């Protein structure tokens, strides 16, 4: 098989970068800061312009002291180390990373179309074919990532950027990890967490396939299969054994979903002896041309409106905030490898 051969080459390519990561490939002063696209408890993501090229990037800025307070050091090193090493059309491209006294920076190629989350919430729900177009891309991406021993662990529409050709780029690798065995960290997003994570068992890449079922459900339904006002109530739902489908869900869609949202690991699609092929060969996917999807030759259900290079209207507005860089190095030994 050519898929295997693809994936073997992919792996050589990745391991070379994994084992010898790029470090320190730009400096903050090389970029003009334009606008905040998002904020979080340890950093923010801004639109910037690289002066030397005039290219636009999304620069993620992480406050090292906040990373340390939140016990996210290893996770942050995972994120940069994996991102600099992967290469797949549906993955955001990390063009540069560096650090200074205060902060870590990861500069990704700018995806102006915004997150799937925005377009899904506004439009309400996607048609089955529209959902399937997106789901195919996640299927290929996870097959790629998992072959490299990587677990992604934060699948949700919020992390799926829509590019100028209407294709996805996955962003936000802060919980991705290269692991051959099982792993135990409780992380992810409530609605997307597999039962074995909630129940504190060791788990593996099957959690990504359970999250795929959550995603497809949410894309085709317009709401997730398990929701409540509080996370504890969401967890009781997830572990309960019970999912209801809208009556508009095709019977094939419902059957994929029952196999993806399977509480039982020896039964979960993507986790069986035939692996990802159980999913790619499922009937819900019978019209999908996997190679044309990879090649981006399929016409997209939707192309975001682009007013021009540097537009941010597909992102929400955020209070701006100075970037102050300390005169003293913070946490140097913690982030030495970044």
């Amino acid at each position: 098989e050519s898929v295997k051969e693809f994936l073997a080459k992919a792996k050589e390519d990745f391991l070379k970068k994994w084992e010898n990561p790029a470090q320190n490939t730009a400096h903050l002063d090389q970029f003009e800061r334009i606008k905040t696209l998002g904020t979080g408890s340890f950093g923010r993501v801004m639109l910037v312009k690289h002066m030397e090229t005039g290219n636009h990037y999304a620069m993620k800025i992480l406050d090292k002291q906040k990373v340390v307070k939140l016990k996210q050091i290893e996770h942050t090193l995972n994120e940069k180390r994996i991102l600099q090493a992967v290469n797949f059309p549906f993955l955001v491209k990390l063009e540069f990373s560096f650090k200074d006294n205060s902060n870590l920076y990861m500069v990704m190629e700018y995806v102006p179309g915004g997150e799937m989350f925005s377009h899904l919430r506004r439009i309400g729900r996607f048609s089955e074919p529209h959902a399937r177009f997106y789901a195919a891309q996640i299927v290929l991406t996870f097959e790629y990532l998992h072959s490299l021993d990587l677990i992604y662990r934060d699948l949700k529409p919020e992390n799926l950027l829509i590019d100028q050709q209407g294709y996805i780029q996955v962003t936000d690798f802060g919980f991705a990890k290269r692991v051959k065995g099982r792993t135990w960290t409780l992380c992810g997003t409530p609605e997307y967490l597999a039962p074995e994570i909630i129940l504190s068992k060791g788990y593996n890449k099957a959690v990504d396939w359970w999250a795929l079922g959550v995603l497809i459900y949410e894309m085709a339904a317009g709401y997730p299969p398990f929701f409540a006002d509080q996370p504890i109530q969401i967890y009781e739902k997830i572990v309960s054994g019970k999912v209801r489908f809208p009556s508009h869900f095709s019977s094939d869609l419902k059957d994929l979903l029952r196999n993806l949202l399977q509480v039982d690991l020896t039964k979960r699609f993507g986790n069986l002896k035939d692996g990802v092929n159980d999913i790619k060969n499922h009937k819900w996917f019978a019209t999908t041309d996997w190679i044309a999807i990879y090649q981006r030759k399929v016409e997209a259900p939707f192309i975001p409106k682009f007013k021009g290079p540097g537009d941010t209207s597909n992102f929400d507005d955020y209070e701006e905030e100075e970037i102050r860089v300390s005169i003293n190095e913070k946490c140097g030994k913690e982030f030495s490898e970044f």
Binding site: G40, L70, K71, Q72, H75, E115, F117, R121, D154, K156, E158, G174, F175, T185, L186, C187, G188, T189, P190, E191, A221, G222, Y223, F227, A228, D229, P231, R244, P246
Partner: peptide, 20 residues
Amino acid sequence: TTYADFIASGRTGRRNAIHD
């Protein structure tokens, strides 16, 4: 409807990761 119960819930905006 489930759609109405969703839209009226406190989880229709961007959802935060958890950890720990």
